[PDB]
């Protein structure tokens, strides 16, 4: 099976702007992610599939949180840590996007941890102003920080 995720800017007044699509796709190796997007700042972007089906913005420690409601990394597996598409943490954890001098994003990643579209269906993807150093160190969830876009994995 395959799927198509629209993915929209992350406000403080939720969904904004349509920034690309993601093509989710089993594969030998994983599913494929084969991600268009534009309007990034170049550079490397955490990617992750999150655990709820919403993008909408929340509260937390009373500061108004961007796609706070997609909640956390898709963790079925209840690890409580990121360790990237390699490691054995969140299974939600994708491989790095990389955004050229333009802002855009072409590419597909893999995640070889994941095999079935059904696994996260009714969940979330989600990119992040930062990177992703596949650790939580120095910085939690890979050094992420704010989220950039979301979109829901119906
Ligand atoms: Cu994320
Ligand atoms: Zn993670």
């Known amino acids: 099976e395959s799927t198509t995720v629209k993915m929209y800017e992350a406000l403080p007044?939720?969904?904004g702007k349509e920034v690309g699509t993601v093509v989710?796709?089993?594969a030998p190796g994983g599913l494929h992610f084969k991600v268009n997007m534009e309007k990034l700042t170049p550079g490397y972007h955490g990617f992750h599939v999150h655990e709820?089906?919403?993008?909408?913005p929340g509260e937390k420690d009373g500061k108004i949180v961007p796609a706070l409601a997609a909640g956390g990394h898709y963790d079925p597996g209840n690890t409580h840590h990121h360790l990237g598409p390699?490691?054995?943490g969140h299974?939600?954890?994708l491989p790095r996007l990389s955004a050229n001098?333009?802002?855009?994003?072409?590419e597909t990643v893999v995640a070889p941890h994941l095999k079935k579209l059904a696994e996260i269906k009714q969940?979330?993807?989600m990119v992040h102003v930062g990177g992703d150093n596949y650790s939580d160190k120095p910085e939690p969830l890979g050094g992420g920080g704010a989220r950039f876009a979301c979109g829901v994995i119906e």
């Not at 709820?52 to 909408?56: L, M, V, W």
């Not at 001098?101 to 072409?106: E, F, L, N």
């Open 123 to 125: 969940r979330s993807l």
């Open 13 to 15: 007044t939720g969904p």
């Open 52 to 56: 709820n089906p919403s993008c909408a």
């Open 101 to 106: 001098a333009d802002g855009k994003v072409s």
């Open 86 to 88: 390699e490691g054995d």
């Open 24 to 26: 989710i796709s089993e």
């Open 91 to 93: 299974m939600g954890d």
